[PDB]
Amino acid sequence: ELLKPRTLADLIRILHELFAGDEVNVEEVQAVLEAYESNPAEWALYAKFDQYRYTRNLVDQGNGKFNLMILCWGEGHGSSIHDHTDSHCFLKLLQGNLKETLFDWPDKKSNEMIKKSERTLRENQCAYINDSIGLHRVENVSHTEPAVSLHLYSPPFDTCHAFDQRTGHKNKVTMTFHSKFGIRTP
Ligand SMILES: [Fe+2]
């Protein structure tokens, strides 16, 4: 039943099964993501980089219940501190490394956001975040190696909040897709 994905295509089929229902077995989804061994040739089509910031490239629109996408992080590129809009969010490294910094939800008082923790996500590892866990910022701190990650969100969402680290104030951000199914979408 839970079988090792042989290919990205195979993983995508398995994901369609795991999200056949109304709920989400987070551990099984994370297990399957982690078991797929990144094969660059199978995701080259989606790995479209931008010189100035990380790009989000839609891979599969899911069955209504999730989106699967590939994020490409140039050297030194990172995200804001942000939430995931009441969704499950899985992140699997396909190439390089990313630093994830965890932050607590801020209190309504204006205060510096101090980090709860940090980790280095390494190739093939799959992390999970959701709002009840906290907020995070994800960065590729490498000076020399681009990173590529595979992200699954469920339900799909196209807006989130970015947080100001000095004060914890949030602002709503609309998320863009740099490409969809291999096609650049300006
Ligand atoms: Fe995130």
Tab-separated table of N, CA and C and ligand atoms in Angstrom, residues 54 79-80 82-84 89 91 129 136-138 151 153 157 175, ligand 1:
chain	number	residue	atom	x	y	z
A	54	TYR	N	13.624	33.485	-4.897
A	54	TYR	CA	13.162	32.134	-5.131
A	54	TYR	C	11.848	32.143	-5.889
A	79	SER	N	12.988	33.325	2.283
A	79	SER	CA	11.597	33.700	2.342
A	79	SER	C	11.424	34.681	3.464
A	80	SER	N	10.213	35.186	3.600
A	80	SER	CA	9.874	35.931	4.784
A	80	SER	C	9.634	34.920	5.858
A	82	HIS	N	6.637	33.435	7.723
A	82	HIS	CA	5.306	33.303	7.151
A	82	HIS	C	4.519	32.136	7.698
A	83	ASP	N	3.212	32.181	7.463
A	83	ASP	CA	2.322	31.146	7.901
A	83	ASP	C	1.927	30.370	6.650
A	84	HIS	N	1.078	29.372	6.832
A	84	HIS	CA	0.640	28.539	5.725
A	84	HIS	C	-0.894	28.380	5.676
A	89	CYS	N	1.648	21.664	5.114
A	89	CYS	CA	2.699	22.066	4.204
A	89	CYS	C	3.896	21.154	4.323
A	91	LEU	N	7.649	19.937	2.740
A	91	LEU	CA	8.757	20.490	2.010
A	91	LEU	C	9.816	19.394	1.861
A	129	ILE	N	5.270	21.520	8.138
A	129	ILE	CA	4.879	22.638	8.964
A	129	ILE	C	3.383	22.847	8.802
A	136	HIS	N	7.540	29.962	10.006
A	136	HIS	CA	8.914	29.705	9.666
A	136	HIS	C	9.394	30.619	8.583
A	137	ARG	N	10.693	30.609	8.430
A	137	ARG	CA	11.379	31.269	7.340
A	137	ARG	C	12.272	30.166	6.805
A	138	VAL	N	12.438	30.115	5.494
A	138	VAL	CA	13.249	29.068	4.884
A	138	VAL	C	14.246	29.823	4.040
A	151	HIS	N	7.341	21.091	-2.738
A	151	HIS	CA	6.355	21.500	-1.744
A	151	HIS	C	4.931	20.993	-2.071
A	153	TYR	N	0.989	21.330	-0.531
A	153	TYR	CA	0.101	22.013	0.367
A	153	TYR	C	-1.317	21.560	0.178
A	157	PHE	N	-3.434	26.847	-1.247
A	157	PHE	CA	-3.694	28.225	-0.865
A	157	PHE	C	-2.856	29.149	-1.720
A	175	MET	N	0.486	34.934	-3.364
A	175	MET	CA	1.575	34.139	-3.872
A	175	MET	C	1.343	33.940	-5.343
B	1	FE	FE	6.728	28.068	4.225
